[PDB]
Write a protein that binds this ligand. Structure first.
Ligand code: ZN
Lengths: 157, 240, 288
């Protein structure tokens, strides 16, 4: 309410340090809900989202769902680039595939295209490139539609 | 797709008023609230379909009402009944630009009927699909669903010696954690309502890379038996 | 192209006013006049203004299609602009309703063999009221398209299906010989701004108090009427004690209800009195 982001940062850095992964995830998600549903000043919203992103990045173990929410809401290509940098440094293939699929399932087209182009320029693992291209996801959904079809043709007749 | 009851109560008078095109609009909208909903999920679903059949029949109805009922039947039983409309995004908060654009376009079919097909933009499949992640190959594995099987199922098809002699002488609703989890295969219809109750098996050749969040997205598993072969569902691109 | 159902005829203010003035002036003769406009496109038929054809001594039949008058009026209207086509004809059907007859069908056939997209707008000055001027264009069905049963109507829009065909119009045959059209009066800011002047009083009438003898006789008469109505109200309240609802639902049907009269008299005299006070004070202060 007071538009005091620095006080939020100080309180978070004071409290979350002496806490576990799950508890910090809970408090950060509560803060994210408050920012999403209550904050009106869009610039303040972007600021708090960015600081939450930084706090989750610095946190030892990171729940990538929260970072996915943050990068989706803020819609910043560089932040997702830093996220993928950290993920490739950790060399988590399953985490990489899951985060790429989640980003494909929910992201603005411009950000997705820019991130794919930058990842290709940096020459990441081609699995991430093809996944983020969007072809495998739509292909799998098409397969789901084709295999499990159930149509009431009699009703149409 | 939310299936909110109060909206249905408000729409109930609208679908029965004298004015025909209001009936058409109400019928189309009512099929947008109850998309991918079975009679077991909500008692009012079956009567709405009966009303749709009655309006499609009973030739003494205005053409606007006939068109509304036909398009409502088309929407309510969406493609293979395996796809829903989700203006809201997944666990995150997003408008999902494609869906909003498509539904704005579908609301424009008051001056161009061909534009009604634009609603196919917003159609989003309902699936909890698993992949190996090592090679992006779909495996076959069962998952636990802690709910009654009698709810999240496809609706039924369209249907239309003297004693013996004296014997004759005298003749003159929550479904919340119902336990007993039942296996659901991969690549199967997972309603967003039931997606929260979907759970994996603690022991399996494949274990999720993360904790399942009850959404309708893609979950990458982890091969705990990287040597043995298992049956793979082949994607349409795969056989070329 | 089998036409469409979203076709709309756009009638300007000039055309509609001339239509009504000419229709009311010839009751009950079905006067007819041409209709100068332009064909914007397949879906829109703009109409600029109309002019009247003379009514020959035929009576109640629309058959005077004199060509000399039409040619002269068209040629020497061009001298002062209005370079437009002969888009349609309008004829008034006073009293019956909006529907075409056999003679009307033949005349519209004659027009169609010249333009093939000629509307047949039918005014009706008799049954028109201030806000519901009844107007609806018509155009003949093709011919043997009834073998295809596809009378030229492609419902590519809901804008044409919203209008509902009249009951008595179907008796003469609406969807059998002439598919109906839509009517959309299109205005202009200049015209709607300044037609407001019909209800703008003269400036020198607001401050004009009327003679100060009638304003006292009226007050005295209103007070006497109030006294009598109050007495009737007293007897009404007395009589209402012993009456059952099935009578009160129909009791004051044929006799003066001495309550609405009281309220009406009070409101009317109070409004007149307030206006009188304000006028008197305003002139006493400002005029001096
Ligand atoms: Zn006539």
């Amino acid at each position: 309410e007071g538009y005091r982001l620095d006080i939020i940062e100080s309180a978070l850095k004071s409290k979350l340090d002496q806490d576990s992964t799950s508890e910090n995830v809970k408090i950060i998600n509560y803060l994210l809900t408050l920012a999403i549903t209550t904050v009106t000043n869009s610039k303040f919203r972007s600021s708090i989202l960015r600081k939450s992103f930084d706090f989750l990045m610095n946190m030892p173990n990171c729940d990538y769902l929260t970072l996915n929410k943050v990068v989706v809401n803020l819609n910043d290509a560089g932040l997702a680039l830093q996220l993928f940098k950290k993920l490739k440094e950790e060399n988590d293939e399953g985490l990489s595939a899951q985060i790429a699929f989640d980003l494909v399932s929910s992201a603005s087209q411009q950000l997705l295209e820019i991130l794919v182009t930058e990842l290709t320029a940096q020459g990441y693992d081609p699995a991430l490139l093809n996944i983020l291209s969007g072809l495998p996801t739509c292909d799998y959904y098409n397969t789901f539609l084709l295999n499990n079809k159930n149509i009431d043709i009699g009703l149409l007749n | 797709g939310k299936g909110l009851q109060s909206a249905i109560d408000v729409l109930d008078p609208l679908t029965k008023d004298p004015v025909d095109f209001v009936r058409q609009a109400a019928m189309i909208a009512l099929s947008m609230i109850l998309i991918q909903q079975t009679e077991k999920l909500n008692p009012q679903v079956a009567d709405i379909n009966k009303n749709f059949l009655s309006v499609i029949t009973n030739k003494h109805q205005e053409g606007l009402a006939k068109f509304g009922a036909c398009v409502a039947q088309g929407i309510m039983n969406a493609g293979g009944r395996n796809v829903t409309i989700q203006l809201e995004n997944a666990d995150t908060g997003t408008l999902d630009t494609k869906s909003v654009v498509g539904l704005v376009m579908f609301s424009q079919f008051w001056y161009w009927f061909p534009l009604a097909h634009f609603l196919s933009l917003s159609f989003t499949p309902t699936t909890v699909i698993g992949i190996r992640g090592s090679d992006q190959a779909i495996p076959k594995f069962q998952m636990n669903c802690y709910a009654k099987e009698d709810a999240f199922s496809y609706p039924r098809m369209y249907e239309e010696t003297t004693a013996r002699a004296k014997a004759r002488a005298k003749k003159t609703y929550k479904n919340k954690y119902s336990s007993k989890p039942y296996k659901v295969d991969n690549m199967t219809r997972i309603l967003p309502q039931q997606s929260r109750y979907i759970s994996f098996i603690k022991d399996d050749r494949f274990v999720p890379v993360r904790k399942f969040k009850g959404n309708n997205g893609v979950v990458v598993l982890r091969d705990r038996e990287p040597k043995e072969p298992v049956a793979l569902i082949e994607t349409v691109r795969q056989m070329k | 192209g089998r036409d469409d159902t979203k076709e709309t005829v756009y009638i300007s203010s000039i055309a509609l006013l001339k239509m009504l003035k000419h229709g009311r002036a010839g009751v009950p003769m079905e006067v007819m006049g041409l209709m100068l406009g332009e064909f914007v496109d397949d879906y829109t038929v703009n109409v600029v203004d109309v002019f009247a054809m003379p009514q020959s001594g035929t009576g109640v039949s629309v058959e005077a299609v004199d060509d000399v008058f039409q040619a002269k009026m068209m040629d020497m209207l061009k001298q002062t602009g209005r370079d437009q086509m002969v888009v349609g004809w309008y004829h008034s059907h006073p009293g019956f309703g909006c529907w075409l007859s056999s003679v009307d069908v033949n005349t519209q056939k004659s027009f169609e063999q010249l333009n093939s997209r000629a509307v047949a707008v039918v005014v009706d000055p008799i049954q028109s009221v201030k806000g519901k001027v009844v107007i609806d264009a018509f155009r003949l069905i093709d011919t043997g398209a009834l073998i295809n049963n596809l009378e030229p109507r492609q419902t590519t829009s809901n804008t044409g299906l919203l209008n509902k065909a009249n009951i008595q119009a179907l008796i003469h045959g609406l969807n059998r010989h002439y598919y109906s059209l839509n009517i959309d009066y299109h205005k202009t800011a200049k015209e709607t701004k300044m037609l407001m002047n019909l209800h703008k009083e003269q400036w020198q009438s607001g401050l004009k108090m009327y003679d100060y003898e009638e304003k006292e006789e009226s007050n005295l008469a209103a007070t006497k009427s109030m006294v009598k109505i109050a007495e009737q109200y007293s007897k009404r309240i007395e009589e209402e004690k012993e009456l059952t609802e099935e009578e009160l639902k129909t009791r004051y049907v044929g006799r003066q209800d001495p309550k609405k009269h009281l309220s009406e008299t009070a409101d009317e005299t109070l409004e007149n009195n307030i206006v009188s006070v304000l006028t008197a004070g305003v002139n006493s202060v400002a005029i001096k």
